[PDB]
Amino acid sequence: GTFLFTSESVGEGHPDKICDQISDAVLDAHLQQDPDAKVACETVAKTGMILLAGEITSRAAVDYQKVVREAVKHIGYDDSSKGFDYKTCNVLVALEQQSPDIAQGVHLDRNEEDIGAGDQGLMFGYATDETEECMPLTIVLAHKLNAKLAELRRNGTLPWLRPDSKTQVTVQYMQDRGAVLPIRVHTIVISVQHDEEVCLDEMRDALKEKVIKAVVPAKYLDEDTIYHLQPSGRFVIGGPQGDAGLTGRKIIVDTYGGWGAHGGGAFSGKDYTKVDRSAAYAARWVAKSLVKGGLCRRVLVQVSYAIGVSHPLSISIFHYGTSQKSERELLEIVKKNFDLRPGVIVRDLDLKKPIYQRTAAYGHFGRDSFPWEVPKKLKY
Amino acid sequence: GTFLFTSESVGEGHPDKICDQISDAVLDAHLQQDPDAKVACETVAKTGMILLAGEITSRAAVDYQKVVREAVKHIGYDDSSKGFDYKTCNVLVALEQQSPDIAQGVHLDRNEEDIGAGDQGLMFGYATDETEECMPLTIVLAHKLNAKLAELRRNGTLPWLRPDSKTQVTVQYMQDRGAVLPIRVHTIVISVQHDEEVCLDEMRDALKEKVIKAVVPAKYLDEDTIYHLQPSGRFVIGGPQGDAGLTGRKIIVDTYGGWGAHGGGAFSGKDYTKVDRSAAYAARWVAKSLVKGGLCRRVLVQVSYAIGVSHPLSISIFHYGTSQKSERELLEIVKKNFDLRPGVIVRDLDLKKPIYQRTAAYGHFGRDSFPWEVPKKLKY
Numbered sequence A, B: 001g002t003f004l005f006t007s008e009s010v011g012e013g014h015p016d017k018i019c020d021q022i023s024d025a026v027l028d029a030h031l032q033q034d035p036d037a038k039v040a041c042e043t044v045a046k047t048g049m050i051l052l053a054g055e056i057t058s059r060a061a062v063d064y065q066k067v068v069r070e071a072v073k074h075i076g077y078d079d080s081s082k083g084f085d086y087k088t089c090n091v092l093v094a095l096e097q098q099s100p101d102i103a104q105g106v107h108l109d110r111n112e113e114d115i116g117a118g119d120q121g122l123m124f125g126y127a128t129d130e131t132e133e134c135m136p137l138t139i140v141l142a143h144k145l146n147a148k149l150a151e152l153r154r155n156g157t158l159p160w161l162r163p164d165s166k167t168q169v170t171v172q173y174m175q176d177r178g179a180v181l182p183i184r185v186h187t188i189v190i191s192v193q194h195d196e197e198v199c200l201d202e203m204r205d206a207l208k209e210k211v212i213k214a215v216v217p218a219k220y221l222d223e224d225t226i227y228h229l230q231p232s233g234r235f236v237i238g239g240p241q242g243d244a245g246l247t248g249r250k251i252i253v254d255t256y257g258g259w260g261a262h263g264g265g266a267f268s269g270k271d272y273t274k275v276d277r278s279a280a281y282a283a284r285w286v287a288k289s290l291v292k293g294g295l296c297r298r299v300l301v302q303v304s305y306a307i308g309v310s311h312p313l314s315i316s317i318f319h320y321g322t323s324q325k326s327e328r329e330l331l332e333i334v335k336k337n338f339d340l341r342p343g344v345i346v347r348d349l350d351l352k353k354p355i356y357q358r359t360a361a362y363g364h365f366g367r368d369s370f371p372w373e374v375p376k377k378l379k380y
Ligand SMILES: C[S@@+](CC[C@H](N)C(=O)[O-])C[C@H]1O[C@@H](n2cnc3c(N)ncnc32)[C@H](O)[C@@H]1O
Pocket: A014, A015, A016, A164, A165, A166, A191, A192, A232, A233, A234, A235, A236, A237, A238, A239, A242, A243, A244, B039, B040, B055, B056, B098, B099, B101, B102, B105, B118, B119, B307
């Protein structure tokens, strides 16, 4: 009845995550001035370069140089010794207006509640009762290990740390009537960029004592747990210098760490009309509402859309055998309690608010009581 | 017992898919001259621009201008009237050597069979007996609809078609002892870029008669099937002009259309040492071998790695209740029959061969008898 499952997370300075945070800093800058901004901002990062590419139609006047550099400063890349510096990097902009053909088919001359989906696509929401926040333990622990590295870097405890990091956690689970129960941590990987002076033994000792022990409960760690700490042996070159980053290349880290399912759409740099983000947030909200409402212990929700059409084309629910209700019954409850048109999701989840940069590291789900994390009281 | 499931696909001229094909054209160009090239080529596409960003260490002498332009010509973007032209677009190159810190930790001074994984990560393989090629019907049909559009564009049957397209198929399934049985097609979406002269009614009639009827068996289509054909109403602006493209933004289209699971890693532009691609191909090979071998009807395989370590950190198998063997028994069969070190997968799957551009549109799986699609005869 036991099995292993692995998930990973990355830090704020991982190059792909830098791009997600910059794309959402650009989105938030537009929404601060124009709540109805149409934004599709992709970011690319390589040695010394941030490139913004995409489509924005907005009444805002945004200083992209300032917005980009402030996001990079927050992450911690502030000196050429670290491989990247917000003060002196190149910021290139290739942003055009939203295609008028998309605009006419999606939102022009449409009542807000009846706006079409901004694209076709499929999206999933997932929730599990294995943690209070209704997220898989593998991904929660992986995110917390990266957050702990950033905390110790920022407080000067481990001054050799740099912003680029990756973690990976394998947990041994027990199957429990469709639900899953974590038993123990089988393997942990941590790789983090570091300065030239610190030795490997000092880093491995600190990663075990100050990072892992400060995050993972001792009850999950035993004599058999395997640790791969700085497994490459050297990670001085990092950030965009070590690996090109792009927006929307960490979509599994952003969601459920491999659990549930994913429809392929990226979240960062997109306004509410792009259902890749708004409908995935709404599907998480539905899934978490079904679990917190006591209808299931674990659930997956799929929705899909066509560009220009407001109502979802399909809606499906899988409860893994953890509900006494059938899928037909759960779908009826969802129909009576939720309206998954993008023009209604925007109102329910307050999706014109400029809080998106806060979602772009450490996962979009299971944190900070964002609107999609506050369960809806269900009537049935 | 019935449920709906939706998957999507995109055409060769969808901007993200253009990037995947260019990244793999670059990889193949290097492998033609240097089978041991270390390649991590990301591509970005926006109006008039192809940018290559990433890391390559290779003995090859590659003309990036020629390679990029030839890939764009093949796709069909050959005139400014179509929104993009291989002859006159900008090709920008920001490629550096592979980080020496990665090289020393992964492959320098290592026996080939004992090379480390090129990164950490998790990967999944999936197979289902619902089609002969062991793929979900939703994604197979979605890919075939895009392939049919390209065929009719290239043969001059529908000369108003342009290369950028997206499709989406929703199928109603029956649950069958853990396996799934397709019953009927519930909804089809097709959006395709077109010339200025053709009217909406002519396009909708052609998409139903010449595309859908030529691909989807009539037994799956009935009076209740919903069709969303050119649902935006106008799609003249397309390709990179309509939407920025990036490599590795169609990872669900590249794999199982939402079925199974995904670990987050992109495939295109990466050599075999990047386990995001090689271990996902090996996991598909294992899953398809278990189904064709008669051990299960449907199966999911997870593997994970740490950078610099050759053997997977974890291996898991889920048979959805479709096998008489336990996960422990299936794992033992996999251990006796497969070696999932990257330096052994390269030999089994011939991963230094320059066939990667062929994988970069219409899915990496279920087509053309690539090595990961030829089942291994299992001994047990
Ligand atoms: C290993 S790199 C990806 C492969 C790379 N594109 C190449 O050229 O081989 C992927 C991520 O791993 C991390 N990384 C970079 N250099 C590393 C090193 N020396 N050791 C461990 N992890 C590293 C960074 O987070 C980076 O974004």
